[PDB]
Amino acid sequence: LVHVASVEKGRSYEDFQKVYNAIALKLREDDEYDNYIGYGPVLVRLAWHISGTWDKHDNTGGSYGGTYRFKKEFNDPSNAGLQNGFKFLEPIHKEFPWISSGDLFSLGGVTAVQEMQGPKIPWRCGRVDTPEDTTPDNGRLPDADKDAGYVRTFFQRLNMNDREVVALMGAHALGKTHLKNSGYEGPGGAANNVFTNEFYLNLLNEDWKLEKNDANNEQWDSKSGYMMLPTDYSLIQDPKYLSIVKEYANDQDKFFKDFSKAFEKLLEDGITFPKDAPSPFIFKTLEEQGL
C-alpha cells in the first residue's frame, strides 16, 4: 500500500480551524462526563487507537482510512469505552460533512491536548476514507499486563524508538482506567484533565504496591489513591526508559517538545504527503481567539 494524502476539496486553514473551534466548544460544554474529568482524555485515547493499528511492514492500518467507523474495528475488545468519544464527535461530523473520518478522529486528539493546556501539536490534513475491507483485523493494539521488553518490541512495529515511547506514555497522566472497559481501575495522579509531567513524577515519587484488583488483574497501587499499569511500571524497571522518565520529571518543557513531535509522528504514520500539500497547520486555542 501507498496512501497518498488528498486535501478535502477546496478547504483551507480557516475551515479546519472551525472544526477545531467546534470540538473545543463542546469540550467546554460537556464538562460533566466521567465524574467531571470531561471528554479530553477519551478523545486523545481515540486518536492513538485509530493510529496504533499501523504496521510498517505492509503499510496496513494507521489513521488514514478512518476504518474505526466499521463494525470490526469499532467492536474490537481493545477499543471498549471509545464509543463515548465517537458519540461526542458525531454531531460535529454532521455540522462539517466534508471532513474525512481519519482527519476528524485525529484532530479530536490534537484539540483535546491543546485545550488541556498541552503543547501545540502541528496537524496535517489529507486522510481519505477507505472501504470496509481495508479495516485491520483485531489484535494489533498492545496488552497492559506485560513488561518493558514487550513495550519496546511493540512500538518498533510503529517505528517509535525509546524516547518517543516514553514521551507518548506521558499521556497516561490524563483520565483513568475503568474496570468495565479494560479490567483495570483507577486514576494515575491528581491533575487528570490538565496536561503536565505528572505521570513521571508519580512514577518516581510514589510508594507503589503490587495488588490484584476486582477483575483479577495486577496493578501497581499507591497510598495516595493512584494506579499504574504493569506496562507503565515497566518504564522504571528498564534502565534506558528510566533515564528518560527522570529527564521529563525534571523538565516539563522538554517533555512537551518531545510529546509534540512524537504524537504528530504517530498520527501521520503510513501516509505519504506530496510536496504540493499544505505545510502542517498550528491551530489557535479558544483562549487565543477570545472565544
Could you tell me the three cell numbers for 278?
499544505
| Interaction of residue 255 with ligand HEM, rule CB under 6 A | no
The smaller minimum CB distance to ligand HEM, of residues 182 and 213, is found at: 182
Q: Residue 178: what are its φ and ψ, rounded to 5°? A: -130, 130
Q: Which of 168, 235, 244, 267 binds ligand HEM (CB under 6 A)?
A: 168
Closer CB to ligand HEM, 128 or 174, in the complex: 174
CB proximity list for 213: less than 8 A, separation 6 or greater = 179, 183, 184, 185, 219
Site string for ligand HEM, 70-109 (x = CB under 6 A): -----------x----------------------------
Size of the site for ligand HEM (CB under 6 A): 22
CB of 254 to ligand HEM, least distance (A): 17
When binding is defined by CB under 6 A, the residue of 3, 69, 127, 172 that contacts ligand HEM is: 172
In this chain, which stretch among 40-48, 65-73, 196-204, 277-285 interacts with ligand HEM, using CB under 6 A? 40-48
Residue 129: CB atoms within 10 Å: 14
HEC sequence for 163-212: HHHHHHHHHHHCCEECHHHHCCCEECCCCCCCCCCHHHHHHHHCCEEEEE
Q: Does position 48 bind ligand HEM by CB under 6 A? A: yes
Instruction: Give the helix, strand, coil percentages of the chain, each rounded to 5.
Output: 50, 10, 40
Q: Does position 45 bind ligand HEM by CB under 6 A?
A: yes
140 binds ligand HEM, rule: CB under 6 A: no
C-alpha to C-alpha distance for 42 and 1, rounded to whole angstroms: 30
Cell 496493578, residue located? 219
Which C-beta is closer to ligand HEM: that of 130 or that of 258? 258
The answer to whether 171 contacts ligand HEM (rule: CB under 6 A) is yes
Residue number, nearest CB to ligand HEM:
175
Of 5, 19, 27, 44, the one binding ligand HEM by CB under 6 A: 44
- Does 119 engage in binding with ligand HEM (CB under 6 A)? no
- Side chain identity at residue 236, one-letter code: I
DSSP 245: H
User: What are 21's three cell numbers?
Assistant: 473551534
Only one of the segments 57-65, 178-186, 242-250, 277-285 lies at the binding site for ligand HEM (rule: CB under 6 A); that segment is 178-186
Q: Rule CB under 6 A: which of 142-161 touch ligand HEM? A: 142, 144, 151
Q: Tell me the CA distances in angstroms from 115 to 22, 110, 285, one per residue in order.
A: 12, 9, 6
Can residue 174 be called a binding residue for ligand HEM (CB under 6 A)?
A: yes
- Give the Cα-Cα-Cα angle 26, 50, 41 (nearest 5 degrees): 40
Amino acid identity at 38: G
Kindly state whether residue 184 participates in binding ligand HEM, applying the rule CB under 6 A: yes
**Residue written as grid cell 483535546:** 112
Contact positions vs ligand HEM (CB under 6 A): 41-42, 44-45, 48, 81, 142, 144, 151, 168-169, 171-172, 174-178, 181-182, 184, 231
